[PDB]
Amino acid sequence: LAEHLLKPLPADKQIETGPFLEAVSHLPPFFDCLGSPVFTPIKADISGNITKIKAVYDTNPAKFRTLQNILEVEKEMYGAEWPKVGATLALMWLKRGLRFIQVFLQSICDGERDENHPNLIRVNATKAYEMALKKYHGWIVQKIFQAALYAAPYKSDFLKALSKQNVTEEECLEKIRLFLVNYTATIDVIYEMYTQMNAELNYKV
Numbered sequence: 001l002a003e004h005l006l007k008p009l010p011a012d013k014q015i016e017t018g019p020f021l022e023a024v025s026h027l028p029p030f031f032d033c034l035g036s037p038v039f040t041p042i043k044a045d046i047s048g049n050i051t052k053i054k055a056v057y058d059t060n061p062a063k064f065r066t067l068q069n070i071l072e073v074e075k076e077m078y079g080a081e082w083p084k085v086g087a088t089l090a091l092m093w094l095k096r097g098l099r100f101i102q103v104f105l106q107s108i109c110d111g112e113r114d115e116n117h118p119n120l121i122r123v124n125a126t127k128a129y130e131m132a133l134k135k136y137h138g139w140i141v142q143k144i145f146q147a148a149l150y151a152a153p154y155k156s157d158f159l160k161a162l163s164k165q166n167v168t169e170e171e172c173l174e175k176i177r178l179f180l181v182n183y184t185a186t187i188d189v190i191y192e193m194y195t196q197m198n199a200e201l202n203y204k205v
């Protein structure tokens, strides 16, 4: 995770598409080692979105040099169906999965815990879901997340699974904190871009 850091934001706060996709494509694999088949559809959604954006990018790397480029070009390209189309729509849902990972990881690092059951990650996962995904899910998908939550490893095993490696828990969390710097900054910029472009949508699934 400290092996595949996201680049820092350039001065103009424009995110290069190529480098961005490469960076985040290292994230899906971490779902395989949460030790449950329950997490496979979650991996699939994040991968699929990354793959959707990559495919739009590949058609014209220069036209789609930056994430901003993607949104402005596709807006012009699709008139009235935008923002509910193309790579704009893929990235709208990618950012939410990425924000989820962000909030979950920051929560853990901040020493947030259920005092009653302290070696679990339920409370961190629950917060991340509430902050990133919950308002865009109908009640059925919510009840599904609730169930999926019990497949979560212990905090202790999860951190041991990320050092996959001769390292203490505190060392491991320091590494995650370093990763969260440019990660958070980058996601914050993508979210800000959806707000300025008016490209954010609120439909539930």
Ligand SMILES: CCCCCCCCCC
Pocket (backbone or CB within 6 Å): 001, 027, 030, 031, 034, 101, 104, 125, 148, 149, 152
């Ligand atoms: C570093 C990427 C790890 C992803 C965290 C996902 C945990 C999900 C619990 C529901």
Ligand SMILES: CCCCCCCC
Pocket (backbone or CB within 6 Å): 021, 022, 025, 026, 028, 046, 047, 048, 050, 051, 054
């Ligand atoms: C460089 C991006 C390629 C698409 C990867 C799919 C997500 C694992």
